[PDB]
């Protein structure tokens, strides 16, 4: 196609493109509210965290670092930050 609209690509292909090859760079990661069961406090955790995140009120782990995304422990809740 010779008349592709480069100025206004739809969010489908905008998301499917690589982070750097987008029109404006967009990180694919995010921050999440994590809720450990048996605890009241809420932890702000990076999605792609490289470190074992621990509760301060309890000696329990919230995520385990992996290749791309930290795997949250089972029974822990999480929600997005400001989309």
């Amino acid at each position: 196609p010779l008349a592709k609209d480069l100025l206004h690509p739809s969010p489908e292909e905008e998301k499917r493109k690589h982070k750097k090859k987008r029109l404006v760079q967009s990180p694919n990661s995010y921050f999440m509210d994590v809720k450990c069961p048996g605890c009241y406090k809420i932890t702000t955790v990076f999605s792609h965290a490289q470190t074992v995140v621990l509760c301060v009120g309890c000696s329990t782990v919230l995520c385990q670092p992996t290749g791309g995304k930290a795997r949250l422990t089972e029974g822990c809740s999480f929600r997005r930050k400001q989309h």
Binding site: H18, K19, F31, A49, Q82
Partner: protein, 150 residues
């Protein structure tokens, strides 16, 4: 591509367009500065300080929230490392490779990697002496560099 490898990878970090601090970040500039001070006392290099702060405390960019970079903050407080982090790690790797090589004399691959690492060390040292981070007469001696790292 890579300096000393035939790799042309693209894995990087896409810093977001919004330079503003997120609204849910309750932490203030002095609080983040205190956290950096405590981590540096515990002995973390600035890369590790940034990684810990992003992973656990929810701060996206220390420069965005405080206005100064992590190494700037450390140097202002006066507890920055004498050697730069990357040069220290390169010298660490060179010392480790030399320690392996003095036991494995037939590891010509290790000799080749050692040559590459030392070339990187000398180029980075030239840059740091140009920027006057390092003393003008600072020289990397392979024999004496063992006591500088680890």
């Amino acid at each position: 591509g890579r300096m000393h490898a035939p790799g042309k990878g693209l894995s990087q970090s896409a810093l977001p367009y919004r330079r503003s601090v997120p609204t849910w970040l309750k932490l203030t500039s002095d609080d983040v500065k205190e956290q950096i001070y405590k981590l540096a006392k515990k002995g973390l290099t600035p890369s590790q300080i940034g990684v810990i702060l992003r992973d656990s405390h929810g701060v996206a960019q220390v420069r965005f929230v405080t206005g100064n970079k992590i190494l700037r903050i450390l140097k202002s407080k006066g507890l920055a490392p004498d050697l730069p982090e990357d040069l220290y790690h390169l010298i660490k790797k060179a010392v480790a490779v030399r320690k392996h090589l003095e036991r494995n004399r037939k590891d010509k691959d290790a000799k080749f990697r050692l040559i590459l690492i030392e070339s990187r060390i000398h180029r980075l040292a030239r840059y740091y002496k140009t920027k006057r981070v390092l003393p003008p007469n600072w020289k990397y001696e392979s024999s004496t560099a063992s006591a500088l790292v680890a």
